[PDB]
Design a binder for these strands. Structure first.
Ligand SMILES: [Mg+2]
Ligand SMILES: [Mg+2]
Ligand SMILES: [Mg+2]
Ligand SMILES: [Mg+2]
Ligand SMILES: [Mg+2]
Ligand SMILES: [Mg+2]
Ligand SMILES: [Mg+2]
Ligand SMILES: [Mg+2]
Ligand SMILES: [Mg+2]
Ligand SMILES: [Mg+2]
Ligand SMILES: [Mg+2]
Ligand SMILES: [Mg+2]
Ligand SMILES: [Mg+2]
Ligand SMILES: [Mg+2]
Ligand SMILES: [Mg+2]
Ligand SMILES: [Mg+2]
Ligand SMILES: [Mg+2]
Ligand SMILES: [Mg+2]
Ligand SMILES: [Mg+2]
Ligand SMILES: [Mg+2]
Ligand SMILES: [Mg+2]
Ligand SMILES: [Mg+2]
Ligand SMILES: [Mg+2]
Ligand SMILES: [Mg+2]
Ligand SMILES: [Mg+2]
Ligand SMILES: [Mg+2]
Ligand SMILES: [Mg+2]
Ligand SMILES: [Mg+2]
Ligand SMILES: [Mg+2]
Ligand SMILES: [Mg+2]
Ligand SMILES: [Mg+2]
Ligand SMILES: [Mg+2]
Ligand SMILES: [Mg+2]
Ligand SMILES: [Mg+2]
Ligand SMILES: [Mg+2]
Ligand SMILES: [Mg+2]
Ligand SMILES: [Mg+2]
Ligand SMILES: [Mg+2]
Ligand SMILES: [Mg+2]
Ligand SMILES: [Mg+2]
Ligand SMILES: [Mg+2]
Ligand SMILES: [Mg+2]
Ligand SMILES: [Mg+2]
Ligand SMILES: [Mg+2]
Ligand SMILES: [Mg+2]
Ligand SMILES: [Mg+2]
Ligand SMILES: [Mg+2]
Ligand SMILES: [Mg+2]
Ligand SMILES: [Mg+2]
Ligand SMILES: [Mg+2]
Ligand SMILES: [Mg+2]
Ligand SMILES: [Mg+2]
Ligand SMILES: [Mg+2]
Ligand SMILES: [Mg+2]
Ligand SMILES: [Mg+2]
Ligand SMILES: [Mg+2]
Ligand SMILES: [Mg+2]
Ligand SMILES: [Mg+2]
Ligand SMILES: [Mg+2]
Ligand SMILES: [Mg+2]
Ligand SMILES: [Mg+2]
Ligand SMILES: [Mg+2]
Ligand SMILES: [Mg+2]
Ligand SMILES: [Mg+2]
Ligand SMILES: [Mg+2]
Ligand SMILES: [Mg+2]
Ligand SMILES: [Mg+2]
Ligand SMILES: [Mg+2]
Ligand SMILES: [Mg+2]
Ligand SMILES: [Mg+2]
Ligand SMILES: [Mg+2]
Ligand SMILES: [Mg+2]
Ligand SMILES: [Mg+2]
Ligand SMILES: [Mg+2]
Ligand SMILES: [Mg+2]
Ligand SMILES: [Mg+2]
Ligand SMILES: [Mg+2]
Ligand SMILES: [Mg+2]
Ligand SMILES: [Mg+2]
Ligand SMILES: [Mg+2]
Ligand SMILES: [Mg+2]
Ligand SMILES: [Mg+2]
Ligand SMILES: [Mg+2]
Ligand SMILES: [Mg+2]
Ligand SMILES: [Mg+2]
Ligand SMILES: [Mg+2]
Ligand SMILES: [Mg+2]
Ligand SMILES: [Mg+2]
Ligand SMILES: [Mg+2]
Ligand SMILES: [Mg+2]
Ligand SMILES: [Mg+2]
Ligand SMILES: [Mg+2]
Ligand SMILES: [Mg+2]
Ligand SMILES: [Mg+2]
Ligand SMILES: [Mg+2]
Ligand SMILES: [Mg+2]
Ligand SMILES: [Mg+2]
Ligand SMILES: [Mg+2]
Ligand SMILES: [Mg+2]
Ligand SMILES: [Mg+2]
Ligand SMILES: [Mg+2]
Ligand SMILES: [Mg+2]
Ligand SMILES: [Mg+2]
Ligand SMILES: [Mg+2]
Ligand SMILES: [Mg+2]
Ligand SMILES: [Mg+2]
Ligand SMILES: [Mg+2]
Ligand SMILES: [Mg+2]
Ligand SMILES: [Mg+2]
Ligand SMILES: [Mg+2]
Ligand SMILES: [Mg+2]
Ligand SMILES: [Mg+2]
Lengths: 210, 206, 60
RNA sequence: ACGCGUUAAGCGCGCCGCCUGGGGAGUACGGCCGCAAGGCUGAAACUCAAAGGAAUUGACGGGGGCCCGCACAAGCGGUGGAGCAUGUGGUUUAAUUCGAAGCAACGCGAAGAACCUUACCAGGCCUUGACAUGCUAGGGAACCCGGGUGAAAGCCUGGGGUGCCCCGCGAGGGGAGCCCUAGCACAGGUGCUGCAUGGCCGUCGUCAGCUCGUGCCGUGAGGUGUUGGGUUAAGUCCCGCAACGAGCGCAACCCCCGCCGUUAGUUGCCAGCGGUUCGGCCGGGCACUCUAACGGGACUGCCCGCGAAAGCGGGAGGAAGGAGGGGACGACGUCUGGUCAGCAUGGCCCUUACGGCCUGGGCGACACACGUGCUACAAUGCCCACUACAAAGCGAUGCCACCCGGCAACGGGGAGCUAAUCGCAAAAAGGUGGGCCCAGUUCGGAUUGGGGUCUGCAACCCGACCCCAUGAAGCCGGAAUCGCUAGUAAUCGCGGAUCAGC
RNA sequence: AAAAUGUAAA
RNA sequence: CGCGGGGUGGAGCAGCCUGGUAGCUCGUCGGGCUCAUAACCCGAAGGUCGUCGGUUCAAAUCCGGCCCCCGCAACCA
């Protein structure tokens, strides 16, 4: 869905929705940094280099903006508008103030001479403002859950190493270190992701039973 | 890496085959296969002798292995007892009527295959490679040679970084056919890898 | 697969077609000049060495 | 150090001004000036382990001068486009074994993948092993024959010989050997690391370069020599020179070709004669051709011009002339180049398995991309008939004459040759004759149908070959790109290595 | 007159 | 609520007046150059025209409704 290619080669960023069965169950353990040691394709001379990439896997979550407002959780005030209008502006409660109770957010509108023309506008703005307020909440939740998962730093931020010269891949968490990297690069991840699943499940017994 | 073998380049020019016999076509590939096995036991047993060249001749059926050594005594033994069991093991494996033969090497400091051994042996015994090249190139030069040069490749001194290391005096016109030169290889086995030893001895043109 | 396979080569087979010629020195199966029973590399060395009778550096 | 040197940057004295690591910073604050722009005075925190001066040696330049290479240019033929062959990327798969990566990976390791090869895959298997050196305990005897189940490997299992050594009157006894069933040392690994290595190779480059000794210059790195003028393919020589020499390179010494000669005369050859069954075929002969071993030949020696020399430009005589053509030969080094999978090898790891055997599959997959190739698009062409002229190689586990059968691939018979005897062998472009008529054709030969031959235990995956039929894209190829300077390119066939066959 | 760029470990 | 404009390949705009026919620049994909990337050169793919109806032999094009976007208007008290 997004893919910022870094000239040659990659992907300076790529994002994918992996749909299926047991996806977040198995692909959960990739959240963190991945170190690579190899002679880079970009190398002028013949020096071995260390690099890293960050992976975040957030599960596919449900999401639904509330059915607009519902007048039950709302206080509406009516009153006289301020400024021009003559006879009519003084004897006519044409100003609206709708107070959305669950958030305390308030709009007022004394734009037009019609009270419901203003209630309409004040219901329009209040809508956009509670939506925009929840979107932002849901934003800096997603945007800050990644900050942790993704692991800001690099070269030294966690998880596992892929050494091409020695052919070893190794997970630093379970301290597993099987050096059949060829297959792992071909997607044969299970001889890696299954050890973590068991070791993590041994931290579940010893957790409320130890 | 690109230089030719000095012997291979001077066949029939300043150098003769270390095996001299005819063979039609039907039996060449086992005359030789045996021939090769002959230098097998010979080099293996006569290390102590300092064997410089094996000249295998073949008459009617019968073999005729001549052998050149620095110190001949090792080969012969008390009352010539090793030299007999020698030609014994030979006909025991060849199945063909054999031939003992030994002529010594007059000046051991003029046979590259000898020099190479003595070098590679030294570094097998943790001797300073650099100052031992100049030593060998001295003796070979001081022993009358018209030219001399020794080369050592591999992890010198046990160093992680392998390297070439050589010295030379006099001439070594390797391009010149008219020149006679002696070549000599040796392999220094070590607790830290393997180092190749090469010798060049220029014994004047002709 | 090395010394075990050089041994299959020596064994008289089950069918004549399964014959293959190995090197009589290094043990290579591919590129095998039959005149010597040698491989193309073993050949080259001994040739330079002068331990192969009569054969010399060609030139014309 | 560069340089300065009575116009000091020398040797001295007098006085003023100024500096005290780089960045922060000529910034901030304060003060003084200014219309303003701004100026004078002028910090600190913080941060770095350097900043910097000259000089040396390289490399580099969209710097210079002099040269050079199929580098451009001048030319002929090509790839890129088409169908096929093959190598690679990729994707795919149980596996599509591994390595190679711009030049210098990609018809490369592979100079022979159906099984074998085979390192991968699924599966049935074996555990001191397929191999080496030994050490054990029931300890039988070699080695031929067999049952058995099975896809084989394997696992189970039935008869024998009436062996051998010491020598015992003897009914048996202990030796050795190989095999035997367990056990222990150990074997084994194409498992990793070419960035721990040897060896060998690629490459800059057949480019003319790279250095040492001593001396001399410089505080030193270093310089001088190697530079300079001439000359050369060349650090090739010449002359010059605070340098004098030397080594590895260049050249020569080696092979092949072109000319002549000496030696040699069959299985080669045939010029004059003899026999002619009009055939080197018999007699006969070594002259020529040939074959193959030793020589001769070329030296800028000769002539003109120039030159200080080296030599350069021309001339002649010569088979050949200034290196006659071709090959063999690859400096100090550079690329952390290639290869641990040809072999070697330090360290690391696997141990009823990361070792071993077998059967079958795969390395030949196919939405795609590339490298190298083959065959074409036709008339300077294509088909059929006939008829000529080659060099190099191979072959008594082989090459096959020639009759016979077959449209053929080939098969059956069968002569000769271990071969300058005999054979593969037909050379093909060529020449002569006939046909084709500018057509998607008598161009083209991919695709596929049918029917067969040979090698192999076996051609489904997966072979080459033959016959009938089928008769695709292709009308000369976008951007772009390759080779070659003389017996070269283009074109035409022949042979060989590997190898049952391909 | 053409013609930008080459991160980070020996 | 009123009036005017608009929705066409991933982005940005033509074509509608006058019915038949889909264009431009960019991006993208494949092949070149280059040691490599870009610039540059060659070749290609990509929309079924907001959404429902209707007119017509035929609708991006003409007509009605709806949805989303844009500009204007909303005065006298
Ligand atoms: Mg690079
Ligand atoms: Mg890093
Ligand atoms: Mg919602
Ligand atoms: Mg609400
Ligand atoms: Mg109220
Ligand atoms: Mg007011
Ligand atoms: Mg009122
Ligand atoms: Mg009222
Ligand atoms: Mg009222
Ligand atoms: Mg108002
Ligand atoms: Mg880490
Ligand atoms: Mg690697
Ligand atoms: Mg590691
Ligand atoms: Mg699982
Ligand atoms: Mg080198
Ligand atoms: Mg070479
Ligand atoms: Mg040499
Ligand atoms: Mg010795
Ligand atoms: Mg075979
Ligand atoms: Mg001075
Ligand atoms: Mg003066
Ligand atoms: Mg003055
Ligand atoms: Mg002045
Ligand atoms: Mg003065
Ligand atoms: Mg002073
Ligand atoms: Mg100071
Ligand atoms: Mg400071
Ligand atoms: Mg100032
Ligand atoms: Mg200023
Ligand atoms: Mg202050
Ligand atoms: Mg101030
Ligand atoms: Mg002022
Ligand atoms: Mg003013
Ligand atoms: Mg002013
Ligand atoms: Mg101002
Ligand atoms: Mg200003
Ligand atoms: Mg060129
Ligand atoms: Mg050209
Ligand atoms: Mg490729
Ligand atoms: Mg490997
Ligand atoms: Mg059986
Ligand atoms: Mg072991
Ligand atoms: Mg490594
Ligand atoms: Mg090496
Ligand atoms: Mg290379
Ligand atoms: Mg040259
Ligand atoms: Mg060359
Ligand atoms: Mg000096
Ligand atoms: Mg100086
Ligand atoms: Mg010289
Ligand atoms: Mg001069
Ligand atoms: Mg006639
Ligand atoms: Mg006569
Ligand atoms: Mg005569
Ligand atoms: Mg004669
Ligand atoms: Mg001659
Ligand atoms: Mg003069
Ligand atoms: Mg002339
Ligand atoms: Mg010549
Ligand atoms: Mg010529
Ligand atoms: Mg030459
Ligand atoms: Mg290195
Ligand atoms: Mg290294
Ligand atoms: Mg290296
Ligand atoms: Mg075990
Ligand atoms: Mg005719
Ligand atoms: Mg004719
Ligand atoms: Mg010839
Ligand atoms: Mg043949
Ligand atoms: Mg043969
Ligand atoms: Mg046979
Ligand atoms: Mg045959
Ligand atoms: Mg016939
Ligand atoms: Mg007939
Ligand atoms: Mg017939
Ligand atoms: Mg017929
Ligand atoms: Mg026949
Ligand atoms: Mg017959
Ligand atoms: Mg016969
Ligand atoms: Mg013809
Ligand atoms: Mg057509
Ligand atoms: Mg068929
Ligand atoms: Mg058969
Ligand atoms: Mg087609
Ligand atoms: Mg045409
Ligand atoms: Mg046309
Ligand atoms: Mg035509
Ligand atoms: Mg010519
Ligand atoms: Mg840039
Ligand atoms: Mg930049
Ligand atoms: Mg770079
Ligand atoms: Mg260094
Ligand atoms: Mg308008
Ligand atoms: Mg209008
Ligand atoms: Mg408008
Ligand atoms: Mg509108
Ligand atoms: Mg509209
Ligand atoms: Mg439109
Ligand atoms: Mg758009
Ligand atoms: Mg417009
Ligand atoms: Mg419209
Ligand atoms: Mg209009
Ligand atoms: Mg492109
Ligand atoms: Mg580019
Ligand atoms: Mg319609
Ligand atoms: Mg239309
Ligand atoms: Mg419609
Ligand atoms: Mg429309
Ligand atoms: Mg509408
Ligand atoms: Mg208003
Ligand atoms: Mg008004
Ligand atoms: Mg009024």
């Amino acid at each position: 869905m997004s893919a910022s290619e870094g000239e040659h080669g990659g992907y300076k960023e790529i994002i994918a929705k992996i749909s299926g069965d047991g996806v977040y169950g198995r692909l959960k353990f990739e959240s963190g940094g991945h170190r690579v040691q190899r002679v880079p394709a970009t190398e002028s001379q013949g020096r071995i280099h260390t690099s890293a990439c960050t992976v975040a896997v957030m599960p596919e979550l449900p999401d639904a903006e509330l059915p607009d407002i519902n007048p039950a959780d709302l206080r509406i005030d009516t009153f006289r508008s301020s400024g021009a209008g003559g006879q009519h502006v003084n004897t006519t409660d044409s100003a609206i103030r709708i107070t959305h109770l669950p958030t305390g957010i308030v709009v007022e509108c004394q734009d037009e001479r019609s009270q419901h023309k203003n209630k309409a506008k004040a219901l329009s703005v209040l809508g956009a403002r509670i939506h925009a307020a929840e979107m932002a909440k849901r934003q800096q939740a997603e945007a800050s859950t990644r900050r942790n998962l993704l692991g800001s730093g690099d070269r030294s931020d966690r998880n596992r190493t892929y050494n091409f010269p020695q052919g070893r891949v190794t997970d630093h968490r379970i301290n597993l270190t099987l050096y059949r990297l060829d297959e792992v690069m071909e997607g044969k991840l299970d001889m890696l992701i299954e050890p973590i699943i068991q070791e993590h499940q041994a931290d579940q017994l010893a957790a409320l039973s130890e | 890496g690109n230089k030719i073998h000095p012997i291979g380049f001077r066949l029939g020019i300043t150098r003769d085959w270390e095996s001299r016999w005819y063979a039609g076509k039907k039996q060449y590939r086992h005359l030789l296969l045996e021939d090769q096995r002959i230098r097998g036991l010979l080099e293996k047993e006569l290390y102590s002798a300092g064997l410089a060249r094996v000249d295998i001749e073949r008459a009617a059926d019968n073999v005729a292995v001549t052998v050149h050594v620095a110190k001949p005594g090792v080969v012969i033994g008390r009352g010539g007892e090793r030299i007999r069991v020698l030609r014994e093991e030979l006909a025991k494996l060849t199945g063909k009527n054999v031939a003992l033969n030994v002529q010594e090497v007059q000046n051991p400091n003029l046979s590259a295959p000898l020099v190479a051994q003595r070098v590679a042996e030294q570094i097998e015994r943790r001797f300073a490679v650099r100052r031992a090249i100049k030593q060998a190139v001295q003796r070979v030069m001081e022993s009358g040679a018209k030219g001399a040069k020794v080369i050592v490749s591999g992890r010198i001194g046990g160093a992680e970084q392998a390297r070439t290391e050589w010295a030379a005096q006099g001439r070594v016109p390797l391009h010149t056919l008219r020149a006679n030169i002696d070549y000599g290889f040796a392999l220094a086995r070590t607790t830290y890898g393997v180092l190749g030893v090469k010798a060049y001895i220029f014994l004047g043109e002709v | 697969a090395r010394k075990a396979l050089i041994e299959k080569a020596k064994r008289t087979p089950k069918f004549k077609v399964r014959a293959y010629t190995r090197c009589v020195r290094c043990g290579r199966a591919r590129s095998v000049y039959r005149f010597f029973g040698l491989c193309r590399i073993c050949l080259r060395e001994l040739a330079h060495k002068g331990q192969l009778p009569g054969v010399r550096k060609a030139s014309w």
